[PDB]
Design a protein around this ligand. Structure first.
Ligand SMILES: *[C@@H]1O[C@H](CO)[C@@H](O)[C@H](O)[C@H]1NC(C)=O
Ligand SMILES: *[C@@H]1O[C@H](CO)[C@@H](O)[C@H](O)[C@H]1NC(C)=O
Ligand SMILES: *[C@@H]1O[C@H](CO)[C@@H](O)[C@H](O)[C@H]1NC(C)=O
Lengths: 505, 51
Protein backbone atom coordinates (compact mmCIF):
# COMPACT_ATOMS: atom_id res chain seq x y z
CA UNK A 1 0.00 0.00 0.00
CA UNK A 2 1.16 3.52 0.84
CA UNK A 3 4.45 4.54 2.47
CA UNK A 4 5.89 7.47 4.40
CA UNK A 5 8.71 8.52 6.74
CA UNK A 6 11.70 8.07 4.46
CA UNK A 7 15.19 8.11 5.95
CA UNK A 8 17.96 7.68 3.34
CA UNK A 9 20.66 7.58 6.01
CA UNK A 10 23.42 5.66 4.20
CA UNK A 11 23.06 6.64 0.54
CA UNK A 12 26.10 6.03 -1.68
CA UNK A 13 27.92 3.67 0.70
CA UNK A 14 28.93 0.85 -1.66
CA UNK A 15 32.32 -0.41 -2.87
CA UNK A 16 31.22 -2.74 -5.66
CA UNK A 17 32.90 -3.55 -8.99
CA UNK A 18 31.91 -4.11 -12.63
CA UNK A 19 29.32 -6.57 -11.33
CA UNK A 20 30.11 -10.05 -12.69
CA UNK A 21 30.38 -8.55 -16.18
CA UNK A 22 27.30 -6.34 -16.61
CA UNK A 23 26.02 -5.08 -13.22
CA UNK A 24 25.79 -6.36 -9.63
CA UNK A 25 26.02 -5.18 -6.03
CA UNK A 26 28.32 -6.18 -3.17
CA UNK A 27 27.10 -4.91 0.22
CA UNK A 28 25.11 -2.06 1.79
CA UNK A 29 25.68 -1.70 5.54
CA UNK A 30 24.89 1.23 7.82
CA UNK A 31 22.41 2.40 10.46
CA UNK A 32 19.00 4.07 10.27
CA UNK A 33 15.94 4.73 12.43
CA UNK A 34 12.23 4.41 11.65
CA UNK A 35 9.70 6.57 13.54
CA UNK A 36 6.36 5.40 14.92
CA UNK A 37 3.58 4.54 12.47
CA UNK A 38 -0.12 3.79 12.74
CA UNK A 39 -1.40 0.18 12.78
CA UNK A 40 -1.93 -0.76 9.15
CA UNK A 41 0.81 1.25 7.44
CA UNK A 42 4.09 0.57 5.63
CA UNK A 43 7.54 2.05 6.26
CA UNK A 44 9.56 1.88 3.05
CA UNK A 45 13.37 1.77 3.10
CA UNK A 46 14.58 3.16 -0.24
CA UNK A 47 18.30 2.89 -0.97
CA UNK A 48 20.28 5.21 -3.24
CA UNK A 49 23.30 4.13 -5.29
CA UNK A 50 25.82 6.53 -6.88
CA UNK A 51 25.88 4.62 -10.17
CA UNK A 52 22.37 3.22 -10.43
CA UNK A 53 19.57 5.78 -10.88
CA UNK A 54 16.99 4.01 -8.68
CA UNK A 55 16.77 1.02 -6.35
CA UNK A 56 14.20 -1.11 -4.54
CA UNK A 57 12.60 -0.50 -1.13
CA UNK A 58 12.00 -2.46 2.08
CA UNK A 59 8.48 -2.25 3.51
CA UNK A 60 7.69 -2.78 7.20
CA UNK A 61 4.15 -3.91 8.06
CA UNK A 62 2.65 -3.71 11.56
CA UNK A 63 -0.76 -5.22 12.34
CA UNK A 64 -1.27 -5.43 16.11
CA UNK A 65 0.44 -4.04 19.22
CA UNK A 66 -0.46 -6.27 22.18
CA UNK A 67 0.70 -6.23 25.81
CA UNK A 68 2.71 -9.41 26.41
CA UNK A 69 5.55 -10.39 28.74
CA UNK A 70 8.95 -12.03 28.46
CA UNK A 71 9.79 -15.71 29.04
CA UNK A 72 11.90 -16.09 32.18
CA UNK A 73 11.50 -19.88 32.38
CA UNK A 74 9.42 -22.74 31.00
CA UNK A 75 8.29 -25.98 32.63
CA UNK A 76 5.47 -28.52 32.62
CA UNK A 77 3.48 -29.48 35.72
CA UNK A 78 1.66 -32.83 35.35
CA UNK A 79 -1.17 -34.21 37.45
CA UNK A 80 -0.40 -36.62 40.28
CA UNK A 81 -2.37 -39.18 42.27
CA UNK A 82 -2.01 -41.19 45.50
CA UNK A 83 -0.74 -44.77 45.13
CA UNK A 84 0.94 -46.96 47.74
CA UNK A 85 1.43 -50.55 48.87
CA UNK A 86 2.66 -52.55 51.86
CA UNK A 87 3.93 -55.97 52.94
CA UNK A 88 3.68 -58.17 56.04
CA UNK A 89 6.79 -60.34 55.85
CA UNK A 90 7.91 -62.12 59.01
CA UNK A 91 11.38 -61.75 60.50
CA UNK A 92 12.32 -65.47 60.56
CA UNK A 93 16.01 -64.41 60.51
CA UNK A 94 18.45 -61.90 61.98
CA UNK A 95 17.21 -59.11 59.72
CA UNK A 96 14.35 -57.72 61.85
CA UNK A 97 15.82 -58.42 65.29
CA UNK A 98 15.54 -54.89 66.74
CA UNK A 99 15.34 -52.36 63.89
CA UNK A 100 14.81 -52.78 60.17
CA UNK A 101 16.91 -49.82 58.91
CA UNK A 102 20.18 -49.76 60.88
CA UNK A 103 21.10 -46.12 60.28
CA UNK A 104 20.21 -44.91 56.78
CA UNK A 105 19.08 -47.85 54.60
CA UNK A 106 16.18 -46.49 52.54
CA UNK A 107 16.39 -48.85 49.53
CA UNK A 108 13.82 -51.28 50.93
CA UNK A 109 13.46 -53.36 47.76
CA UNK A 110 14.29 -57.07 48.00
CA UNK A 111 14.17 -57.61 44.21
CA UNK A 112 10.41 -58.20 44.50
CA UNK A 113 8.61 -54.83 44.69
CA UNK A 114 6.95 -53.23 41.67
CA UNK A 115 9.07 -50.07 41.85
CA UNK A 116 11.30 -51.14 38.94
CA UNK A 117 8.84 -50.04 36.27
CA UNK A 118 8.57 -47.32 33.63
CA UNK A 119 5.03 -46.27 34.60
CA UNK A 120 5.55 -46.01 38.38
CA UNK A 121 7.86 -42.95 38.56
CA UNK A 122 9.86 -42.30 41.79
CA UNK A 123 9.14 -41.74 45.51
CA UNK A 124 10.17 -42.51 49.09
CA UNK A 125 10.40 -46.06 50.48
CA UNK A 126 9.82 -46.09 54.23
CA UNK A 127 9.27 -48.68 56.94
CA UNK A 128 6.96 -49.33 59.88
CA UNK A 129 6.44 -51.74 62.77
CA UNK A 130 3.99 -54.59 63.31
CA UNK A 131 2.60 -56.74 66.09
CA UNK A 132 3.22 -60.32 67.15
CA UNK A 133 1.09 -63.35 67.98
CA UNK A 134 -1.22 -65.81 66.29
CA UNK A 135 -3.55 -63.00 65.22
CA UNK A 136 -0.65 -60.90 63.89
CA UNK A 137 0.75 -63.59 61.56
CA UNK A 138 3.85 -64.90 63.39
CA UNK A 139 4.68 -67.17 66.34
CA UNK A 140 6.90 -64.85 68.39
CA UNK A 141 6.08 -61.94 70.72
CA UNK A 142 8.23 -59.48 68.79
CA UNK A 143 7.44 -56.63 66.37
CA UNK A 144 7.77 -57.33 62.66
CA UNK A 145 9.21 -55.22 59.85
CA UNK A 146 6.56 -53.66 57.60
CA UNK A 147 7.90 -51.91 54.50
CA UNK A 148 5.89 -49.53 52.32
CA UNK A 149 6.43 -47.62 49.08
CA UNK A 150 4.37 -44.69 47.81
CA UNK A 151 4.32 -43.16 44.33
CA UNK A 152 2.28 -40.78 42.21
CA UNK A 153 0.51 -41.67 38.97
CA UNK A 154 -1.20 -39.92 36.06
CA UNK A 155 -3.93 -42.03 34.44
CA UNK A 156 -5.42 -39.28 32.26
CA UNK A 157 -2.28 -37.40 31.24
CA UNK A 158 -3.23 -33.74 31.59
CA UNK A 159 -0.29 -31.55 30.55
CA UNK A 160 0.11 -27.90 31.57
CA UNK A 161 2.57 -25.23 30.41
CA UNK A 162 3.51 -22.42 32.82
CA UNK A 163 5.88 -19.54 32.03
CA UNK A 164 6.53 -17.09 34.88
CA UNK A 165 7.08 -13.45 33.94
CA UNK A 166 7.04 -10.14 35.80
CA UNK A 167 7.93 -7.57 33.12
CA UNK A 168 4.89 -7.06 30.84
CA UNK A 169 6.67 -4.96 28.22
CA UNK A 170 4.82 -3.77 25.09
CA UNK A 171 5.30 -5.74 21.89
CA UNK A 172 3.96 -5.90 18.34
CA UNK A 173 4.05 -7.95 15.14
CA UNK A 174 6.14 -7.20 12.05
CA UNK A 175 5.47 -8.54 8.53
CA UNK A 176 8.79 -7.78 6.83
CA UNK A 177 9.25 -8.13 3.07
CA UNK A 178 12.76 -8.24 1.63
CA UNK A 179 13.52 -6.42 -1.65
CA UNK A 180 14.59 -9.75 -3.17
CA UNK A 181 11.13 -11.26 -2.73
CA UNK A 182 11.21 -13.17 0.55
CA UNK A 183 8.32 -12.33 2.89
CA UNK A 184 8.33 -13.56 6.49
CA UNK A 185 6.95 -12.50 9.87
CA UNK A 186 8.38 -12.24 13.37
CA UNK A 187 7.43 -10.86 16.79
CA UNK A 188 9.88 -8.27 18.17
CA UNK A 189 10.07 -7.44 21.87
CA UNK A 190 10.75 -4.20 23.75
CA UNK A 191 14.53 -4.16 23.53
CA UNK A 192 15.04 -7.89 22.91
CA UNK A 193 16.47 -9.01 19.54
CA UNK A 194 13.94 -10.71 17.27
CA UNK A 195 16.15 -13.39 15.66
CA UNK A 196 17.77 -11.14 13.04
CA UNK A 197 17.02 -12.42 9.53
CA UNK A 198 20.10 -11.77 7.36
CA UNK A 199 21.20 -8.42 8.75
CA UNK A 200 17.88 -6.77 9.58
CA UNK A 201 17.67 -6.28 13.35
CA UNK A 202 14.65 -3.99 13.68
CA UNK A 203 13.50 -3.79 17.31
CA UNK A 204 10.50 -2.22 19.05
CA UNK A 205 10.66 0.55 21.65
CA UNK A 206 8.12 1.57 24.27
CA UNK A 207 7.22 4.54 26.47
CA UNK A 208 7.41 2.98 29.97
CA UNK A 209 3.66 2.64 30.46
CA UNK A 210 2.54 2.19 34.06
CA UNK A 211 0.32 -0.66 35.25
CA UNK A 212 -2.46 -0.85 37.83
CA UNK A 213 -3.06 -4.51 38.70
CA UNK A 214 -0.09 -6.38 37.20
CA UNK A 215 2.02 -7.56 40.15
CA UNK A 216 1.98 -11.40 40.19
CA UNK A 217 0.64 -12.69 36.87
CA UNK A 218 1.74 -15.52 34.58
CA UNK A 219 0.71 -17.17 31.30
CA UNK A 220 -0.20 -20.70 32.36
CA UNK A 221 -1.80 -22.47 29.40
CA UNK A 222 -3.29 -25.89 28.67
CA UNK A 223 -2.40 -28.12 25.72
CA UNK A 224 -5.21 -30.69 25.40
CA UNK A 225 -8.27 -28.48 25.93
CA UNK A 226 -6.46 -25.26 24.90
CA UNK A 227 -7.74 -23.44 28.00
CA UNK A 228 -5.98 -20.32 29.28
CA UNK A 229 -6.00 -18.57 32.65
CA UNK A 230 -4.24 -15.77 34.53
CA UNK A 231 -3.12 -16.53 38.09
CA UNK A 232 0.02 -16.01 40.21
CA UNK A 233 2.35 -18.92 39.50
CA UNK A 234 5.50 -20.18 41.22
CA UNK A 235 9.21 -19.58 40.59
CA UNK A 236 12.21 -21.75 39.67
CA UNK A 237 13.05 -25.06 41.37
CA UNK A 238 13.64 -23.44 44.76
CA UNK A 239 10.00 -23.01 45.76
CA UNK A 240 7.56 -23.36 48.64
CA UNK A 241 4.64 -25.78 49.04
CA UNK A 242 1.15 -24.34 49.42
CA UNK A 243 0.39 -22.96 45.96
CA UNK A 244 1.21 -23.80 42.35
CA UNK A 245 4.65 -25.32 41.92
CA UNK A 246 4.03 -29.04 42.39
CA UNK A 247 6.20 -31.86 40.99
CA UNK A 248 7.70 -30.66 37.70
CA UNK A 249 10.01 -32.40 35.23
CA UNK A 250 12.42 -31.66 32.38
CA UNK A 251 10.34 -31.48 29.20
CA UNK A 252 6.94 -32.30 27.70
CA UNK A 253 8.00 -35.88 26.99
CA UNK A 254 8.86 -36.15 30.70
CA UNK A 255 5.41 -34.83 31.66
CA UNK A 256 3.30 -37.85 30.68
CA UNK A 257 5.57 -40.09 32.77
CA UNK A 258 6.62 -39.23 36.32
CA UNK A 259 9.94 -41.12 36.14
CA UNK A 260 13.22 -39.74 37.47
CA UNK A 261 16.01 -38.01 35.50
CA UNK A 262 14.32 -34.64 35.07
CA UNK A 263 11.55 -34.59 37.66
CA UNK A 264 12.28 -32.54 40.79
CA UNK A 265 10.36 -32.45 44.07
CA UNK A 266 11.58 -30.91 47.32
CA UNK A 267 9.69 -32.57 50.21
CA UNK A 268 6.28 -33.02 51.84
CA UNK A 269 4.06 -33.73 48.83
CA UNK A 270 2.35 -36.99 49.87
CA UNK A 271 1.29 -38.21 53.30
CA UNK A 272 1.13 -41.71 54.75
CA UNK A 273 -0.84 -42.90 57.79
CA UNK A 274 -1.18 -46.61 58.60
CA UNK A 275 -3.07 -48.29 61.44
CA UNK A 276 -2.59 -52.06 61.10
CA UNK A 277 -0.42 -53.35 58.21
CA UNK A 278 -2.40 -51.24 55.74
CA UNK A 279 -0.25 -48.24 54.70
CA UNK A 280 -3.08 -46.24 53.13
CA UNK A 281 -1.98 -43.02 51.44
CA UNK A 282 -4.16 -39.90 51.38
CA UNK A 283 -4.05 -37.05 48.88
CA UNK A 284 -2.65 -33.65 49.86
CA UNK A 285 -1.73 -32.23 46.43
CA UNK A 286 -4.05 -29.30 45.73
CA UNK A 287 -5.97 -29.41 42.46
CA UNK A 288 -6.65 -26.45 40.17
CA UNK A 289 -9.71 -25.48 42.25
CA UNK A 290 -7.69 -24.64 45.37
CA UNK A 291 -5.56 -21.64 44.25
CA UNK A 292 -6.43 -17.98 44.83
CA UNK A 293 -8.85 -15.92 42.69
CA UNK A 294 -7.52 -17.49 39.45
CA UNK A 295 -8.67 -15.04 36.80
CA UNK A 296 -9.71 -16.47 33.43
CA UNK A 297 -9.58 -15.35 29.79
CA UNK A 298 -12.39 -12.77 30.34
CA UNK A 299 -10.56 -10.26 32.55
CA UNK A 300 -11.73 -6.69 33.20
CA UNK A 301 -9.41 -5.82 36.10
CA UNK A 302 -8.88 -2.09 35.73
CA UNK A 303 -8.62 -0.50 32.31
CA UNK A 304 -6.95 -3.54 30.75
CA UNK A 305 -9.15 -6.03 28.87
CA UNK A 306 -7.13 -9.23 28.47
CA UNK A 307 -8.19 -11.39 25.51
CA UNK A 308 -6.91 -14.48 23.69
CA UNK A 309 -5.35 -13.45 20.37
CA UNK A 310 -4.67 -16.31 17.95
CA UNK A 311 -0.93 -15.98 17.35
CA UNK A 312 2.23 -18.07 17.36
CA UNK A 313 4.72 -18.04 20.26
CA UNK A 314 2.11 -16.17 22.31
CA UNK A 315 -1.53 -16.50 23.37
CA UNK A 316 -1.80 -13.71 25.98
CA UNK A 317 -2.95 -10.27 24.85
CA UNK A 318 -5.04 -7.31 25.97
CA UNK A 319 -6.04 -3.82 24.87
CA UNK A 320 -7.18 -0.90 27.06
CA UNK A 321 -8.92 2.24 25.81
CA UNK A 322 -7.15 4.71 23.52
CA UNK A 323 -3.87 5.66 25.20
CA UNK A 324 -2.18 7.69 22.43
CA UNK A 325 1.37 6.86 23.50
CA UNK A 326 4.18 9.37 23.05
CA UNK A 327 6.60 7.48 20.79
CA UNK A 328 6.82 4.01 19.29
CA UNK A 329 9.78 4.37 16.96
CA UNK A 330 11.91 1.41 15.87
CA UNK A 331 15.65 0.84 15.53
CA UNK A 332 16.78 -0.92 12.34
CA UNK A 333 20.32 -2.30 12.16
CA UNK A 334 22.24 -3.51 9.11
CA UNK A 335 24.77 -6.33 8.98
CA UNK A 336 24.62 -7.74 5.44
CA UNK A 337 22.32 -7.73 2.41
CA UNK A 338 22.37 -7.14 -1.34
CA UNK A 339 19.90 -6.12 -4.04
CA UNK A 340 20.16 -6.59 -7.81
CA UNK A 341 20.14 -3.27 -9.68
CA UNK A 342 19.70 -3.20 -13.46
CA UNK A 343 20.84 0.37 -14.23
CA UNK A 344 19.16 -0.01 -17.64
CA UNK A 345 16.06 2.06 -16.91
CA UNK A 346 14.44 3.62 -19.98
CA UNK A 347 11.88 6.34 -20.69
CA UNK A 348 8.70 6.04 -18.62
CA UNK A 349 5.79 8.42 -18.06
CA UNK A 350 2.69 8.19 -15.88
CA UNK A 351 -0.41 10.20 -15.08
CA UNK A 352 -3.07 10.66 -12.41
CA UNK A 353 -6.66 9.60 -13.08
CA UNK A 354 -8.31 9.38 -9.64
CA UNK A 355 -8.06 11.17 -6.29
CA UNK A 356 -10.07 10.64 -3.10
CA UNK A 357 -9.82 10.09 0.64
CA UNK A 358 -10.17 12.07 3.85
CA UNK A 359 -8.51 15.24 5.14
CA UNK A 360 -5.37 14.94 7.26
CA UNK A 361 -6.85 11.95 9.08
CA UNK A 362 -6.11 8.32 9.95
CA UNK A 363 -6.67 6.56 6.61
CA UNK A 364 -5.39 9.52 4.58
CA UNK A 365 -6.16 10.35 0.97
CA UNK A 366 -5.79 7.42 -1.43
CA UNK A 367 -4.64 8.49 -4.91
CA UNK A 368 -4.30 5.85 -7.63
CA UNK A 369 -1.42 6.31 -10.09
CA UNK A 370 -1.07 4.59 -13.47
CA UNK A 371 2.39 4.03 -14.96
CA UNK A 372 3.91 2.22 -17.93
CA UNK A 373 7.51 1.06 -18.32
CA UNK A 374 9.61 -1.87 -19.54
CA UNK A 375 11.21 -2.80 -16.20
CA UNK A 376 9.48 -4.28 -13.14
CA UNK A 377 9.72 -1.91 -10.15
CA UNK A 378 11.89 1.08 -11.12
CA UNK A 379 9.93 4.03 -9.74
CA UNK A 380 10.21 6.70 -7.04
CA UNK A 381 7.71 9.49 -6.37
CA UNK A 382 8.87 12.65 -4.59
CA UNK A 383 6.82 15.79 -3.99
CA UNK A 384 6.28 18.57 -1.48
CA UNK A 385 4.22 17.99 1.65
CA UNK A 386 4.68 14.22 1.69
CA UNK A 387 6.86 11.61 0.01
CA UNK A 388 5.44 8.20 -0.93
CA UNK A 389 7.27 5.30 -2.57
CA UNK A 390 5.72 2.11 -3.93
CA UNK A 391 6.38 -0.83 -6.23
CA UNK A 392 4.92 -1.49 -9.68
CA UNK A 393 4.90 -4.37 -12.18
CA UNK A 394 5.92 -4.80 -15.81
CA UNK A 395 3.63 -3.23 -18.40
CA UNK A 396 0.59 -1.01 -17.81
CA UNK A 397 -1.43 -1.64 -14.65
CA UNK A 398 -3.24 0.23 -11.87
CA UNK A 399 -1.71 1.03 -8.48
CA UNK A 400 -3.42 2.81 -5.57
CA UNK A 401 -1.39 4.60 -2.88
CA UNK A 402 -2.22 7.07 -0.12
CA UNK A 403 -0.64 10.44 0.66
CA UNK A 404 -0.94 13.06 3.40
CA UNK A 405 -2.40 16.43 2.37
CA UNK A 406 -3.04 19.59 4.39
CA UNK A 407 -5.57 21.35 2.14
CA UNK A 408 -9.23 20.87 1.25
CA UNK A 409 -9.01 21.37 -2.53
CA UNK A 410 -5.96 19.32 -3.57
CA UNK A 411 -4.91 21.02 -6.83
CA UNK A 412 -1.12 21.02 -7.24
CA UNK A 413 1.51 19.73 -9.68
CA UNK A 414 3.89 17.02 -8.44
CA UNK A 415 6.95 15.53 -10.12
CA UNK A 416 7.00 11.80 -10.88
CA UNK A 417 10.02 9.82 -12.08
CA UNK A 418 10.37 6.09 -12.81
CA UNK A 419 14.08 5.36 -12.49
CA UNK A 420 16.03 7.83 -14.60
CA UNK A 421 13.33 9.45 -16.71
CA UNK A 422 11.18 12.13 -15.08
CA UNK A 423 7.82 13.70 -15.92
CA UNK A 424 5.11 15.89 -14.40
CA UNK A 425 1.69 14.97 -13.00
CA UNK A 426 -1.31 16.90 -11.71
CA UNK A 427 -4.12 16.19 -9.24
CA UNK A 428 -7.64 17.64 -9.17
CA UNK A 429 -10.49 16.46 -6.98
CA UNK A 430 -12.63 17.02 -3.90
CA UNK A 431 -11.83 15.63 -0.45
CA UNK A 432 -13.75 15.31 2.81
CA UNK A 433 -12.95 15.39 6.54
CA UNK A 434 -13.51 12.71 9.18
CA UNK A 435 -13.02 13.15 12.92
CA UNK A 436 -12.01 10.59 15.55
CA UNK A 437 -14.71 7.92 16.00
CA UNK A 438 -16.54 7.73 19.32
CA UNK A 439 -17.06 4.84 21.72
CA UNK A 440 -20.13 2.61 21.37
CA UNK A 441 -21.38 -0.33 23.41
CA UNK A 442 -20.66 -3.85 22.22
CA UNK A 443 -17.30 -2.90 20.68
CA UNK A 444 -13.99 -3.40 22.49
CA UNK A 445 -10.43 -2.44 21.61
CA UNK A 446 -8.47 -5.23 19.93
CA UNK A 447 -4.77 -4.28 19.89
CA UNK A 448 -4.12 -0.55 20.54
CA UNK A 449 -4.53 2.97 19.20
CA UNK A 450 -1.58 5.04 17.99
CA UNK A 451 -2.80 8.63 17.58
CA UNK A 452 -5.71 10.71 16.31
CA UNK A 453 -5.47 14.12 14.56
CA UNK A 454 -6.89 16.59 17.09
CA UNK A 455 -4.62 19.59 16.60
CA UNK A 456 -6.65 22.25 14.80
CA UNK A 457 -10.13 21.53 16.24
CA UNK A 458 -11.26 24.79 14.61
CA UNK A 459 -13.29 25.52 11.44
CA UNK A 460 -11.27 27.32 8.78
CA UNK A 461 -13.03 30.42 7.35
CA UNK A 462 -11.62 29.66 3.89
CA UNK A 463 -13.20 26.22 3.54
CA UNK A 464 -16.41 27.42 5.21
CA UNK A 465 -18.96 29.55 3.33
CA UNK A 466 -17.68 28.03 0.07
CA UNK A 467 -20.47 25.77 -1.21
CA UNK A 468 -23.14 28.14 0.14
CA UNK A 469 -22.02 30.85 -2.31
CA UNK A 470 -20.15 29.14 -5.14
CA UNK A 471 -21.93 35.45 -7.97
CA UNK A 472 -20.82 35.63 -4.33
CA UNK A 473 -22.17 39.17 -3.98
CA UNK A 474 -25.49 38.16 -5.55
CA UNK A 475 -25.78 35.15 -3.25
CA UNK A 476 -24.98 37.23 -0.17
CA UNK A 477 -27.56 39.85 -1.17
CA UNK A 478 -30.19 37.17 -1.76
CA UNK A 479 -29.50 35.44 1.55
CA UNK A 480 -29.64 38.78 3.37
CA UNK A 481 -32.95 39.72 1.74
CA UNK A 482 -34.45 36.32 2.54
CA UNK A 483 -33.27 36.52 6.14
CA UNK A 484 -34.70 40.02 6.53
CA UNK A 485 -38.04 38.93 5.07
CA UNK A 486 -38.23 35.88 7.34
CA UNK A 487 -37.26 37.97 10.37
CA UNK A 488 -39.97 40.53 9.61
CA UNK A 489 -42.54 37.76 9.15
CA UNK A 490 -41.56 36.08 12.43
CA UNK A 491 -41.64 39.41 14.27
CA UNK A 492 -45.13 40.10 12.89
CA UNK A 493 -46.26 36.63 13.98
CA UNK A 494 -44.83 37.17 17.47
CA UNK A 495 -46.53 40.57 17.74
CA UNK A 496 -49.85 39.02 16.67
CA UNK A 497 -49.40 36.25 19.23
CA UNK A 498 -48.62 38.70 22.03
CA UNK A 499 -51.63 40.82 21.05
CA UNK A 500 -53.86 37.73 21.13
CA UNK A 501 -52.48 36.65 24.52
CA UNK A 502 -52.81 40.11 26.09
CA UNK A 503 -56.48 40.73 25.32
CA UNK A 504 -59.38 38.26 25.38
CA UNK A 505 -58.06 36.75 28.61
CA UNK B 1 -1.25 -52.72 26.34
CA UNK B 2 -3.03 -54.28 23.36
CA UNK B 3 -1.64 -57.77 22.68
CA UNK B 4 0.56 -60.22 24.61
CA UNK B 5 2.16 -62.97 22.49
CA UNK B 6 -0.62 -63.07 19.91
CA UNK B 7 -3.39 -62.95 22.53
CA UNK B 8 -6.05 -60.25 22.26
CA UNK B 9 -6.26 -58.25 25.49
CA UNK B 10 -7.90 -54.89 24.68
CA UNK B 11 -9.40 -53.16 21.63
CA UNK B 12 -6.80 -50.96 19.93
CA UNK B 13 -6.63 -49.20 16.56
CA UNK B 14 -2.89 -49.59 15.93
CA UNK B 15 -0.80 -52.72 16.44
CA UNK B 16 2.97 -53.12 16.72
CA UNK B 17 5.64 -55.67 17.61
CA UNK B 18 6.14 -57.16 21.08
CA UNK B 19 8.19 -54.96 23.40
CA UNK B 20 9.82 -55.81 26.75
CA UNK B 21 7.64 -54.43 29.54
CA UNK B 22 8.34 -55.05 33.23
CA UNK B 23 5.08 -55.98 34.95
CA UNK B 24 4.05 -58.34 37.73
CA UNK B 25 1.67 -61.25 37.17
CA UNK B 26 -0.09 -64.04 39.03
CA UNK B 27 -2.13 -67.14 38.17
CA UNK B 28 -5.55 -68.08 39.55
CA UNK B 29 -6.41 -71.19 37.52
CA UNK B 30 -7.91 -69.62 34.38
CA UNK B 31 -6.59 -69.67 30.81
CA UNK B 32 -4.84 -66.29 30.57
CA UNK B 33 -2.73 -64.53 33.18
CA UNK B 34 -3.62 -61.42 35.19
CA UNK B 35 -1.10 -58.57 35.31
CA UNK B 36 -1.14 -56.11 38.21
CA UNK B 37 0.93 -53.12 39.32
CA UNK B 38 -0.47 -51.90 42.66
CA UNK B 39 -0.90 -54.78 45.10
CA UNK B 40 -0.48 -55.39 48.84
CA UNK B 41 0.82 -58.81 49.91
CA UNK B 42 0.75 -60.52 53.29
CA UNK B 43 2.82 -63.54 54.33
CA UNK B 44 1.19 -65.87 56.87
CA UNK B 45 2.71 -69.08 58.23
CA UNK B 46 -0.36 -70.65 59.94
CA UNK B 47 1.82 -73.63 61.05
CA UNK B 48 0.32 -75.84 58.35
CA UNK B 49 1.27 -79.50 58.11
CA UNK B 50 2.36 -79.00 54.49
CA UNK B 51 5.39 -76.93 55.55
C1 LIG C 1 -6.16 -12.03 43.91
O1 LIG C 1 -5.52 -12.70 45.06
C2 LIG C 1 -6.18 -12.62 46.34
C3 LIG C 1 -7.10 -13.81 46.44
O2 LIG C 1 -8.18 -13.56 47.33
C4 LIG C 1 -6.90 -11.29 46.50
O3 LIG C 1 -6.92 -10.93 47.88
C5 LIG C 1 -6.18 -10.22 45.70
O4 LIG C 1 -6.73 -8.94 45.98
C6 LIG C 1 -6.32 -10.52 44.20
N1 LIG C 1 -5.48 -9.65 43.38
C7 LIG C 1 -4.13 -9.58 43.33
C8 LIG C 1 -3.34 -10.50 44.23
O5 LIG C 1 -3.57 -8.79 42.59
C1 LIG D 1 -12.06 6.17 -9.89
O1 LIG D 1 -12.81 5.69 -8.76
C2 LIG D 1 -14.19 5.43 -9.06
C3 LIG D 1 -14.85 5.03 -7.76
O2 LIG D 1 -14.55 3.68 -7.42
C4 LIG D 1 -14.29 4.35 -10.14
O3 LIG D 1 -15.66 4.15 -10.48
C5 LIG D 1 -13.50 4.76 -11.37
O4 LIG D 1 -13.49 3.70 -12.32
C6 LIG D 1 -12.07 5.12 -10.99
N1 LIG D 1 -11.33 5.59 -12.16
C7 LIG D 1 -10.14 5.10 -12.51
C8 LIG D 1 -9.52 5.70 -13.74
O5 LIG D 1 -9.58 4.22 -11.86
C1 LIG E 1 9.09 -9.17 -12.92
O1 LIG E 1 8.02 -9.72 -12.14
C2 LIG E 1 7.49 -10.94 -12.66
C3 LIG E 1 6.29 -11.30 -11.81
O2 LIG E 1 5.86 -12.63 -12.05
C4 LIG E 1 8.57 -12.02 -12.66
O3 LIG E 1 8.04 -13.22 -13.22
C5 LIG E 1 9.77 -11.56 -13.47
O4 LIG E 1 10.83 -12.50 -13.35
C6 LIG E 1 10.25 -10.19 -12.97
N1 LIG E 1 11.42 -9.71 -13.72
C7 LIG E 1 11.51 -9.38 -15.03
C8 LIG E 1 10.28 -9.51 -15.88
O5 LIG E 1 12.58 -8.99 -15.50
Amino acid sequence: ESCDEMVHADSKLVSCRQGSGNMKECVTTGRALLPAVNPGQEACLHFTAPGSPDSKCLKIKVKRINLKCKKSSSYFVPDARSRCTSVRRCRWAGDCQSGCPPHSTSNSFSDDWAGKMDRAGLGFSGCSDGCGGAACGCFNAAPSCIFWRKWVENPHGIIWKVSPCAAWVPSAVIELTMPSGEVRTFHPMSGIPTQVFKGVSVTYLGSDMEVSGLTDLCEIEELKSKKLALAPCNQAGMGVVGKVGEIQCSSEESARTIKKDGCIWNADLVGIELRVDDAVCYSKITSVEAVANYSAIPTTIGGLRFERSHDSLGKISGSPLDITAIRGSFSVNYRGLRLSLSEITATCTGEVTNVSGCYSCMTGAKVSIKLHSSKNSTAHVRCKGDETAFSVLEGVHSYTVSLSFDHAVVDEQCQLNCGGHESQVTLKGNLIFLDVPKFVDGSYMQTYHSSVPTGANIPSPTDWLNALFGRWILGVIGVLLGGLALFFLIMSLFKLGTKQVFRSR
Amino acid sequence: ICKIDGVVFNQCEGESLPQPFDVAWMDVGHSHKIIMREHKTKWVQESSSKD
